[PDB]
Structures are given as C-alpha cells and as structure tokens.
RNA sequence: GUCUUGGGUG
C-alpha cells in the first residue's frame, strides 16, 4: 500500500490500515512514513 | 463588556521609524490596508474608482 | 515650535517639523555622526 | 554548523578553506599564522574561519534514519 | 583625458589607480562592479534523494552561493526574457550532483566539484564550478555517513547583485583617495595630536605630504583614486572592470535611447 | 509575507515609463525629471556632470524614500539652453569618458602582460 | 547562540534611531542570522464507547458533514500527509472523523495548518498511545 | 416653550470646534448620499472637502440647536455662526 | 484602506488625550507601522519591540 | 469551543 520504515533497525516494509503497527525484521514500536513521491522545488535564495 | 469592549475593523503591529514620513503620516502594511476595509457610497463623483 | 503653532497654524507647524528633520537628516548623512570608547576617556592632569 | 561557503560581510569564498586550516593547525601554525598563510586579511575573512563551530560532526553521530 | 594605471594584476584581483576623472564616476564604477555586472548562479534546485541531516533549503542555499564559470554569460539571455514555458538551454546551465556514502565506516564530504554539467547552451563556456587550480576540491556542501544519499539537480541562471547577493562577482572593492587629507574631506578626531594618532594610508608615499608652509588650497578637486578590485573566481578582475565599464556604458545608452525617442 | 520581489527594484514594468519630465514653473526654464528603477549610481554621477557645465544653473536629487527605487532630479539652465538638451550633452560627455578609460584600462593591462 | 557581527556606531541615515537599527541586506542574503522553524502538530484517536472510536482517514464529501474549508487533497489514503509537501495556512495535515452517535454518519475532527504559517513537512511519525490506539505526530519545518 | 428669540441669544456668536466637526461630518454624509449641492464644484470630489467648501462660503444649510443646562435651548444657523 | 484614509492610532497605556491621534494613511511594503520621529514622545514610543 | 495554571513582551 504505503511505503513506511522501522524506527529501530531502518527496515522498509509497507503495511495496510489493518495489520498491527509494528516492524518486520526487529519488531519495534514506531515507524515513519517514506518520503513523497511528488518533486519538491526550492527558491535557492 | 459595556465600559470596553472588543471591536471589529482594528489592527496591531510592531512600530518602526522613517524619516521622510510627515508628521500626521502612518505608515500602513499592504496586507492589514487589505484585511482592513472602509465601506464608500457610491456616487456620480466616484463610480468610476 | 510654540511660536510657529501659534503665528501660523497647526498645519504649517506640522510641515516645519518635516523641513527641519529633512535637511538636518541629509546634511547628517553627508557629515556622520559616531561615539566611540575615547569619547568617555580623560587625560592624565584630569584624572590626577 | 559546517563552514559557510562566503564571507557573510564582503563575500569572499571561506568554504574551500576549512581543511587546510584544520591541517595547518595540526602542525603547529597558531591561528593567526594559518589565517595568515590561508590569505585572509581582513578581520571578517578571518572571524568567519576562526569563530566556526563545526557541529555536523555531532549531528553526523546519530544513526541514519532510512 | 581619464588614465588608468595598474600596480598590480593578476587573475583574482587588480589593483589600480585611476585619475583624471571624477570621483562620482570612479564610486559609480565600484557600485556597477558590486552590484549591476551579471554572473551566473545556481537559482532552482531539485530534490530527488536527501537523507542527509541538512535541511533542503540549508543545502540550497549553500548550492546558489557557489561561484560558477560565467565567462560566456553575457552571450546568453535572462531567463524571464526567453519566450520558452519551461526552462531551454538560451537561459539556462543544468548541473547534476549525485553522492552516496558506500561501506559503512567514515564520512563521505560532499564538495562543490562534484557538481556536474550535463546540458547548458554550448558552446559556451559558461556553468562549471569555479576551480582554483587542477587539484582543488571545490567548496564543502554537505557531509554524509552511511546509507546517506544526495541527489539533486540544480539549475543556473543569468542575474545581477541587485537580485542576490550570490550573483555579485565581486567580493570587496578595496577604494580610497587623498591619502594625505589635502582637500580637508575628513577631519580627524583625535586626544593629544591628530598626526601622531591616526596610521597612514598605504598610498600616502604615492603623494607629497602637505609642507608645513602650505596654505589651504581652495580649487583642488579629488582626481587620483586607488582601488583593489576581487572577483569570486565567476569573472576575471579585468573581466569585471571591463564588463563594469560596458554595463555602464549601457545603462547611459538606455538613458539617451528614452531621451531621444521622447521627442 | 509583505516583502517586495529584489527584481522590481530594475525590472521596468510595461504600466510606468522609464523617464518623465515636467516643468518647474516657478522659476524659468527648470525641468522635473524622474527616473523609474534607478539609483544614486546614475543620479549622482549625472548631478556632478551636470553641475560642471557653465550653462547650468541649478542641478540636484533626492531619493525620497529608501524602500522605493527611483529618484527625481530638478534641472535648471540659462535662456538658450534647454534643460533637457543640457542632459543627453552630459549622457554622451559620460559616455565618452567612459569609453576612453576602458579603452585605456585594456591597454594597460595589456602592457602588464 | 549569536553571530560576530561587523558593528559600525553612526547616525548614517536616520532610520535606526530610538532602538532601531540598520543591517546589511547582501551580509542577510549570505545567511546572517538565518534560522530553521520546526513545529510539531499531535493528534490520535479516542474510545468512546464499544465499538465507537475515531479514524484517521482522508474524509470523502458524502459521508461527512462540516469538513473545514481547507483543502484536503494532500492527504494519503492514510489521512496522513507525506513528509516532503509544502504546506500553506489553513490546509490539513491529519484527517480524522468522529462517528454520529444513533448514510451521512460521521462528524470530522481534522487538524489544519496554523492559519499563519507556512513550511514544508518534515517527519510524520506514527505510533500508539499509551491504551494501544493510533497516534500521529507531524513535524513542519520553515527558514526565517 | 423652550426656543429663544434670536434677540436674547446669550451665547457665543462664534462656531465651536465640536459644532464644526459635527456639522462637516453630516454634510459629508449627506452629500455622500447623492444630496444636492450648493457651492459651485470646481475640482474635488471628495465629500469631505466638498462639505469644507460649503462651510466656508456659509452655503450649509443646517442648524445647531444649542441646549442649555436647565432644557432651554437657542437655534443658530450655520450661515450667521462665525468660522475662524 | 488607502493613502491619505484618516485612522485613529494609539498606544497603551493611554494616559492622556495624545495618546490616541488622528492620522493619514500611506501603504507601504513589509509588516511594521512607520512612524515620524517627532511623535514618539506624545505616544511615549520607542521602536525597540 | 470553555476554564485554570505557567512562561513572557511593550
Ligand atoms: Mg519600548
Ligand atoms: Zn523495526
Ligand atoms: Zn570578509
Ligand atoms: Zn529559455
């Protein structure tokens, strides 16, 4: 579904709204999303 | 509330000096000149404006 | 100040404090005007 | 944080400076030398080299994230 | 009339006097050099890969403050002169930077000579990072440790001081006149004795000092003037004073052009 | 959130004019000129050209404010001139000088080699 | 914590009288006293009843009813927004909804941007509360 | 009952500040209501400045009633109130 | 709001009658009100926050 | 959307 990683030992995976919160390789407790797919411009000023 | 009270149509914010202002001159931020308003009749000598 | 005001009126009294700070500003911007840690130092017979 | 790249008060390029002052230092040259040496001569040049805190040395202990 | 005469030149700075000519000319030259001469620099940045602890507009920045080769800028056009709806090669230099700790031990520095140009209005020698010499490394940018990434895709365009400090070719105009005080422009404070207090300029044994006979002069105008121009590594030094020169020349063109044509 | 673009300080727009000139009526044969997306460096160095000629009687600027980028410039001279003659004279004399000094500059830096 | 400026003590122009002050702005555009702004935005879900509870979910027109007037097309489908978008006043950043107690059954309990504020989203975290429900953290970062 | 003969008007023929503020800012309003004008207007179309011309050519056509402390009052027009 | 619209300006505390006055407005660029110099001692202002 | 507490600014 939606790309996330592990908090713990940096493990990418991707759950889908109705499995746990939790990572695969380790287990641990909090996750963070994966950065946007969209481009993101800046002023350089 | 009835000897002061809150009012609409206000604005707040830091001051600054200029040295070519007059002396009954405020200076205005464009965006507090836009969130403020003045409410104008139009007449036959200011429709076009 | 007083005398303008009352010789002239408010609005002309308005304007002379604009002149005054309009030409004083220039010629200060083309003098300078500084203070330094000197300007709070005095000589040795001032000191004795 | 890192080295600014310019001279923040006359723009002067200070960031392709930091490693030779760093080596410099290590050999002994006190600071003033090494900046002499470095050709920075005026005191902002100077203050810009002398004054740094390198912290992305500490930001960079923290384990990547991804 | 006007006469220039370098005491000193090389691919940075030159350092030269200039007489003969009015001393609101010469600090209009040095307000042109500082501020109207055009240069080339990085002004749209793209993110693809950041994983580094900087923040993206940090490493922005850091990226529109690098010196670029602009040699060849003034055969190009200003970006909002340039009838294409996106970005073309007429106003613009693409650089790519791409860099990626591999292994898992030490710290990957990420240096301004590994940006890299891919398109740009050839063959104009317009778009490289300024290098020193042929082993520099350029300046730092960012530092990365392991499974770290930077990928970005810069663009550079054409632009003026005036816009951004980082398009100013110049970094200080070094700029003074009379070294002696004979034209009695300044007037020194001083404690105990004004002579003995202040230290000499480093022109005062290219003039007379003033004899104790003298009387003050009341006609003499300011005419000599020493200055010490440095550049960035974007433009040469006499590259800089000649395209201040021109750029002058050419604003005063535009200014006879509307007078002219008003009539 | 209320700063103004760094490039409206150059950049004409199509709605103002570069240049425009109106009479001082007080005093004869005086002109008002201001000049839109320009500063001190064309003003003062055409006040001191200007100020040079002998058929010039009056000549002066002012910035009014600094957050604004323009300048106006008073311009008086005698009977037979025209103001507006007197300051295309100063344009092509500055231009002139400045081309004889680059022209110099090269030569001297030639010679340097 | 500060920054050596180069200080010159002069009355040069008039405007930093009365405690005000002049400063470079080319030594500004250099990165004088530059700074980040990192504000960090909560929520989670609450149990109010059995099988009652809130949701984070990107909330559909047709069965909700108050959405705000912001905009919520940069939510995943997740009613989270993806670190990396900028983000301007008023514009969601966490999509909730709270049912209606006994189609068209459920109340949004979103959280907005500050209405001030703008900036580019940072880190979403994501985690569980302290009685197992869903938890949402969304740091924004900005330059002044 | 209550109004004064213009004979025995005992207060000051001069118009105050207050009277003139007042009556500028209702000439104002009412000419910025599309009311009909009686200066010639030459130049400005301010209704303010309009109303300031009026006032000075004694052309305003109003009234102060002057109320005293005990409830009587005198009536003034403004054309015969005296502005500095 | 625009150039030359009268607003009422004021400080706290108001201490007295000219601390509240009478201006005429001009629009200008960046967020802080600009005052002429002269008028800081009726207000008691300073333009240090 | 409400009340208290705390840290501050002129
Ligand atoms: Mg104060
Ligand atoms: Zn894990
Ligand atoms: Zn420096
Ligand atoms: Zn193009």
């Given at each position: 579904?939606?790309?996330?990683?592990?908090?713990?030992?940096?493990?990418?995976?991707?759950?889908?709204?109705?499995?746990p919160v939790?990572?695969?390789?380790?287990?641990?407790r909090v996750?963070?999303?994966?950065?946007?797919?969209?481009?993101?411009?800046?002023?350089?000023? | 509330?009835?000897?002061?009270?809150?009012?609409?149509?206000?604005?707040?914010?830091?001051?600054?000096?200029?040295?070519?202002?007059?002396?009954?001159?405020?200076?205005?931020?464009?965006?507090?000149?836009?969130?403020?308003?003045?409410?104008?009749?139009?007449?036959?000598?200011?429709?076009?404006? | 100040?007083?005398?303008?005001?009352?010789?002239?009126?408010?609005?002309?009294?308005?304007?002379?404090?604009?002149?005054?700070?309009?030409?004083?500003?220039?010629?200060?911007?083309?003098?300078?005007?500084?203070?330094?840690?000197?300007?709070?130092?005095?000589?040795?017979?001032?000191?004795? | 944080?890192?080295?600014?790249?310019?001279?923040?008060?006359?723009?002067?390029?200070?960031?392709?400076?930091?490693?030779?002052?760093?080596?410099?230092?290590?050999?002994?040259?006190?600071?003033?030398?090494?900046?002499?040496?470095?050709?920075?001569?005026?005191?902002?040049?100077?203050?810009?080299?002398?004054?740094?805190?390198?912290?992305?040395?500490?930001?960079?202990?923290?384990?990547?994230?991804? | 009339?006007?006469?220039?005469?370098?005491?000193?030149?090389?691919?940075?700075?030159?350092?030269?006097?200039?007489?003969?000519?009015?001393?609101?000319?010469?600090?209009?030259?040095?307000?042109?050099?500082?501020?109207?001469?055009?240069?080339?620099?990085?002004?749209?940045?793209?993110?693809?890969?950041?994983?580094?602890?900087?923040?993206?507009?940090?490493?922005?920045?850091?990226?529109?403050?690098?010196?670029?080769?602009?040699?060849?800028?003034?055969?190009?056009?200003?970006?909002?002169?340039?009838?294409?709806?996106?970005?073309?090669?007429?106003?613009?230099?693409?650089?790519?930077?791409?860099?990626?700790?591999?292994?898992?031990?030490?710290?990957?520095?990420?240096?301004?000579?590994?940006?890299?140009?891919?398109?740009?209005?050839?063959?104009?020698?317009?778009?490289?990072?300024?290098?020193?010499?042929?082993?520099?490394?350029?300046?730092?940018?960012?530092?990365?440790?392991?499974?770290?990434?930077?990928?970005?895709?810069?663009?550079?365009?054409?632009?003026?001081?005036?816009?951004?400090?980082?398009?100013?070719?110049?970094?200080?105009?070094?700029?003074?006149?009379?070294?002696?005080?004979?034209?009695?422009?300044?007037?020194?404070?001083?404690?105990?004795?004004?002579?003995?207090?202040?230290?000499?300029?480093?022109?005062?044994?290219?003039?007379?000092?003033?004899?104790?006979?003298?009387?003050?002069?009341?006609?003499?105008?300011?005419?000599?003037?020493?200055?010490?121009?440095?550049?960035?590594?974007?433009?040469?030094?006499?590259?800089?004073?000649?395209?201040?020169?021109?750029?002058?020349?050419?604003?005063?063109?535009?200014?006879?052009?509307?007078?002219?044509?008003?009539? | 959130?209320?700063?103004?673009?760094?490039?409206?300080?150059?950049?004409?727009?199509?709605?103002?004019?570069?240049?425009?000139?109106?009479?001082?009526?007080?005093?004869?044969?005086?002109?008002?000129?201001?000049?839109?997306?320009?500063?001190?460096?064309?003003?003062?160095?055409?006040?001191?050209?200007?100020?040079?000629?002998?058929?010039?009687?009056?000549?002066?600027?002012?910035?009014?404010?600094?957050?604004?980028?323009?300048?106006?410039?008073?311009?008086?001279?005698?009977?037979?001139?025209?103001?507006?003659?007197?300051?295309?004279?100063?344009?092509?004399?500055?231009?002139?000088?400045?081309?004889?000094?680059?022209?110099?500059?090269?030569?001297?830096?030639?010679?340097?080699? | 914590?500060?920054?050596?400026?180069?200080?010159?003590?002069?009355?040069?122009?008039?405007?930093?009288?009365?405690?005000?002050?002049?400063?470079?702005?080319?030594?500004?555009?250099?990165?004088?006293?530059?700074?980040?702004?990192?504000?960090?935005?909560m929520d989670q879900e609450k149990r109010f009843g059995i099988s009652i509870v809130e949701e984070f979910?990107?909330?559909?027109?047709?069965?909700?009813?108050?959405?705000?007037?912001?905009?919520?097309?940069?939510?995943?489908?997740?009613?989270?927004?993806?670190?990396?978008?900028?983000?301007?006043?008023?514009?969601?950043?966490?999509?909730k909804?709270?049912?209606?107690?006994?189609?068209?059954?459920?109340?949004?309990?979103?959280?907005?941007?500050?209405?001030?504020?703008?900036?580019?989203?940072?880190?979403?975290?994501l985690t569980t509360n302290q009685e197992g429900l869903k938890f949402v953290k969304?740091?924004?970062?900005?330059?002044? | 009952?209550?109004?004064?003969?213009?004979?025995?008007?005992?207060?000051?023929?001069?118009?105050?500040?207050?009277?003139?503020?007042?009556?500028?800012?209702?000439?104002?309003?009412?000419?910025?209501?599309?009311?009909?004008?009686?200066?010639?207007?030459?130049?400005?179309?301010?209704?303010?400045?309009?109303?300031?011309?009026?006032?000075?050519?004694?052309?305003?056509?109003?009234?102060?009633?002057?109320?005293?402390?005990?409830?009587?009052?005198?009536?003034?027009?403004?054309?015969?109130?005296?502005?500095? | 709001?625009?150039?030359?619209?009268?607003?009422?300006?004021?400080?706290?505390?108001?201490?007295?009658?000219?601390?509240?006055?009478?201006?005429?407005?001009?629009?200008?660029?960046?967020?802080?009100?600009?005052?002429?110099?002269?008028?800081?001692?009726?207000?008691?202002?300073?333009?240090?926050?």
């Open positions: 579904g939606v790309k996330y990683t592990c908090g713990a030992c940096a493990h990418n995976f991707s759950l889908n709204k109705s499995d939790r990572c695969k390789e380790c287990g641990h996750i963070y999303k994966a950065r946007t797919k969209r481009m993101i411009q800046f002023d350089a000023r | 509330n009835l000897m002061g009270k809150r009012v609409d149509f206000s604005a707040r914010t830091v001051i600054s000096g200029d040295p070519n202002l007059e002396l009954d001159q405020v200076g205005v931020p464009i965006s507090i000149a836009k969130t403020l308003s003045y409410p104008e009749t139009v007449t036959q000598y200011n429709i076009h404006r | 100040i007083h005398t303008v005001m009352r010789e002239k009126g408010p609005k002309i009294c308005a304007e002379l404090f604009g002149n005054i700070q309009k030409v004083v500003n220039y010629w200060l911007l083309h003098n300078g005007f500084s203070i330094g840690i000197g300007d709070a130092i005095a000589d040795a017979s001032t000191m004795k | 944080m890192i080295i600014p790249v310019r001279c923040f008060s006359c723009g002067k390029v200070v960031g392709d400076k930091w490693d030779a002052y760093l080596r410099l230092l290590e050999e002994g040259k006190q600071e003033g030398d090494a900046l002499d040496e470095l050709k920075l001569k005026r005191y902002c040049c100077r203050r810009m080299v002398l004054t740094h805190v390198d912290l992305i040395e500490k930001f960079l202990r923290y384990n990547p994230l991804e | 009339e006007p006469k220039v005469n370098i005491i000193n030149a090389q691919d940075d700075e030159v350092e030269l006097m200039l007489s003969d000519v009015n001393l609101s000319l010469a600090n209009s030259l040095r307000r042109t050099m500082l501020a109207e001469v055009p240069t080339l620099a990085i002004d749209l940045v793209e993110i693809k890969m950041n994983t580094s602890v900087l923040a993206d507009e940090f490493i922005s920045h850091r990226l529109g403050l690098i010196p670029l080769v602009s040699e060849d800028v003034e055969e190009m056009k200003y970006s909002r002169d340039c009838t294409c709806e996106d970005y073309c090669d007429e106003c613009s230099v693409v650089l790519e930077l791409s860099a990626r700790h591999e292994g898992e031990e030490g710290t990957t520095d990420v240096y301004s000579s590994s940006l890299i140009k891919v398109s740009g209005p050839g063959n104009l020698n317009v778009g490289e990072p300024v290098r020193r010499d042929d082993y520099d490394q350029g300046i730092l940018l960012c530092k990365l440790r392991n499974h770290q990434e930077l990928n970005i895709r810069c663009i550079a365009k054409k632009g003026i001081a005036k816009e951004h400090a980082k398009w100013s070719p110049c970094s200080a105009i070094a700029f003074e006149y009379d070294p002696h005080n004979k034209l009695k422009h300044t007037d020194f404070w001083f404690e105990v004795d004004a002579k003995k207090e202040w230290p000499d300029s480093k022109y005062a044994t290219w003039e007379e000092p003033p004899k104790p006979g003298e009387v003050f002069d009341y006609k003499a105008k300011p005419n000599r003037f020493y200055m010490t121009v440095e550049t960035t590594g974007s433009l040469k030094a006499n590259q800089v004073f000649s395209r201040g020169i021109k750029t002058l020349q050419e604003k005063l063109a535009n200014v006879l052009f509307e007078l002219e044509n008003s009539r | 959130m209320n700063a103004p673009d760094r490039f409206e300080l150059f950049i004409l727009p199509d709605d103002v004019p570069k240049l425009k000139i109106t009479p001082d009526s007080r005093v004869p044969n005086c002109i008002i000129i201001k000049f839109e997306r320009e500063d001190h460096t064309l003003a003062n160095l055409l006040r001191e050209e200007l100020a040079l000629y002998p058929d010039v009687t009056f000549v002066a600027y002012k910035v009014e404010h600094p957050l604004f980028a323009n300048f106006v410039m008073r311009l008086q001279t005698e009977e037979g001139t025209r103001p507006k003659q007197a300051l295309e004279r100063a344009c092509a004399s500055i231009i002139n000088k400045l081309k004889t000094l680059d022209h110099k500059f090269n030569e001297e830096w030639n010679i340097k080699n | 914590a500060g920054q050596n400026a180069i200080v010159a003590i002069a009355c040069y122009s008039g405007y930093n009288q009365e405690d005000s002050m002049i400063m470079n702005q080319s030594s500004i555009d250099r990165g004088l006293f530059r700074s980040l702004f990192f504000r960090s935005y979910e990107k909330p559909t027109r047709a069965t909700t009813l108050r959405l705000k007037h912001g905009t919520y097309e940069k939510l995943d489908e997740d009613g989270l927004i993806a670190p990396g978008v900028r983000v301007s006043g008023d514009d969601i950043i966490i999509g909804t709270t049912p209606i107690p006994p189609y068209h059954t459920k109340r949004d309990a979103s959280t907005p941007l500050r209405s001030t504020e703008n900036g580019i989203v940072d880190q979403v975290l969304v740091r924004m970062r900005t330059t002044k | 009952e209550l109004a004064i003969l213009k004979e025995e008007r005992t207060t000051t023929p001069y118009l105050t500040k207050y009277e003139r503020a007042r009556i500028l800012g209702t000439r104002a309003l009412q000419i910025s209501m599309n009311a009909p004008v009686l200066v010639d207007i030459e130049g400005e179309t301010d209704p303010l400045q309009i109303a300031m011309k009026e006032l000075s050519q004694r052309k305003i056509p109003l009234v102060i009633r002057r109320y005293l402390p005990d409830g009587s009052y005198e009536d003034w027009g403004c054309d015969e109130l005296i502005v500095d | 709001l625009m150039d030359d619209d009268p607003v009422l300006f004021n400080r706290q505390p108001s201490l007295h009658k000219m601390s509240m006055m009478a201006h005429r407005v001009k629009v200008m660029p960046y967020s802080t009100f600009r005052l002429n110099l002269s008028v800081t001692s009726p207000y008691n202002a300073d333009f240090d926050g």
